[PDB]
């Protein structure tokens, strides 16, 4: 309907499994959020619910009176977090997609486009006749496309001189040796 | 100390819209969500469904509990409504644009709440009512939301685009423009 200005009321529940060095260290954070304010949480490093705001205090008290709920939450780093880590390991943790690297001039500015890669950790370096260039380098930053790929533009401000060869070099877990693209002007 | 990966099960219920969501996130990417209308698991990449399973019935039961909890919490807060936070909008492309080479326009809508938004692609001013993919609402650590909309297209200097976004936190429709600078 048009003119729908009715007040809104939002409730969010988040269960976050944090993994450090594989599954060696695991932390579960269960978070209850009313509107935009987290009101109560279960942190596996604590082992019971704690009020985050005063309006979550009733729930923390009630839930902490339940032996079944607490035991289930305390076990969840194994039965939920480590379980789901193993379920998805081969196509998430171990996902590797090689980027496509192109180099093109922008209208003094050379652009290295690095497109379609996964995971996000990447090194993109510029070289002029083999010498690394750092002072004149700017980037979009790491762009998450939403489809389990990333892209970035890494640009070099330069005054190109005939005979010079500029090289964009990409290091990424999807490849065993660096990807390189040259631009000669 | 070194955090390598995070998996989040994120769910919500919104009144009075009676809208829910249930999704899993891995390092910021959606693994799957439960379509609340079709009541089925929707894998973000289709091939994930060849590697793992998920039983959507339990997601729907959680949503029932979430709705009840929301109603209790709304009463307990003396019916304090959410404060609208307007989106910020970015338009980009899947890869560097080349004349008439197939690409995708991406409208990324970020940092907003409540999770209700109207997003329309405009080509030369006109709504593109068909061919647009869209994600569910993705979670943020500040408990706002983000969302992606996707438009496959053929780049041309004849066609300008706007991502048109309506949201209660905005004073007027937000239009992010995009043109092909051949």
């Amino acid at each position: 309907s048009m003119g729908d200005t009715r007040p809104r009321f939002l409730w969010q529940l988040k269960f976050e499994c944090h993994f450090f060095n594989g599954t060696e260290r695991v932390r579960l954070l269960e978070r209850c959020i009313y509107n935009q304010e987290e009101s109560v949480r279960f942190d596996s490093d604590v082992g019971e619910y704690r009020a985050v705001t005063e309006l979550g205090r009733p729930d923390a008290e009630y839930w902490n009176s339940q032996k079944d709920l607490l035991e289930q939450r305390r076990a969840a780093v194994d039965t939920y977090c480590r379980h789901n880590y193993g379920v998805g390991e081969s196509f998430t943790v171990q996902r590797r997609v090689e980027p496509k690297v192109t180099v093109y001039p922008s209208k003094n500015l050379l652009v290295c486009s690095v497109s379609g890669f996964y995971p996000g950790s990447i090194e993109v370096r510029w070289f002029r006749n083999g010498q690394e260039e750092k002072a004149g380098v700017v980037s979009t930053g790491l762009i998450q496309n939403g489809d389990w790929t990333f892209q970035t533009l890494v640009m070099l401000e330069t005054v190109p001189r005939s005979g010079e060869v500029y090289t964009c070099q990409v290091e990424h877990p999807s490849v065993t040796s660096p990807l390189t693209v040259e631009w000669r002007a | 100390i070194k955090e390598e990966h995070v998996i989040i099960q994120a769910e919500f219920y919104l009144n009075p819209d009676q809208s829910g969501e249930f999704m899993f996130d891995f390092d910021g990417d959606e693994i799957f969500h439960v379509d609340m209308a079709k009541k089925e698991t929707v894998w973000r990449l289709e091939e994930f469904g060849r590697f793992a399973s998920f039983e959507a019935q339990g997601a729907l039961a959680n949503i029932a509990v979430d709705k009840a909890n929301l109603e209790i919490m709304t009463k307990r807060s003396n019916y304090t409504p959410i404060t609208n936070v307007p989106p910020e909008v970015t338009v980009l492309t899947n890869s560097p644009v080349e004349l008439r080479e197939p690409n995708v326009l991406i409208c990324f809508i970020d940092k907003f709440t409540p999770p209700v938004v109207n997003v329309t692609w405009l080509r030369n001013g006109k709504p593109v009512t068909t061919g647009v993919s869209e994600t569910v609402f993705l979670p943020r650590e500040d408990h706002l939301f983000r969302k992606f909309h996707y438009l496959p297209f053929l780049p041309s200097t004849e066609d300008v685009y706007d991502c048109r976004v309506e949201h209660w936190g905005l004073d007027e429709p937000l239009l992010k423009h995009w043109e092909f600078d051949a």
Partner: peptide
């Protein structure tokens, strides 16, 4: 195929 497990929501107290 192996299944993702899910955590079940905890109900509030009515009273």
């Amino acid at each position: 195929l192996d299944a993702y497990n899910m955590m079940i929501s905890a109900g509030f107290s009515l009273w």
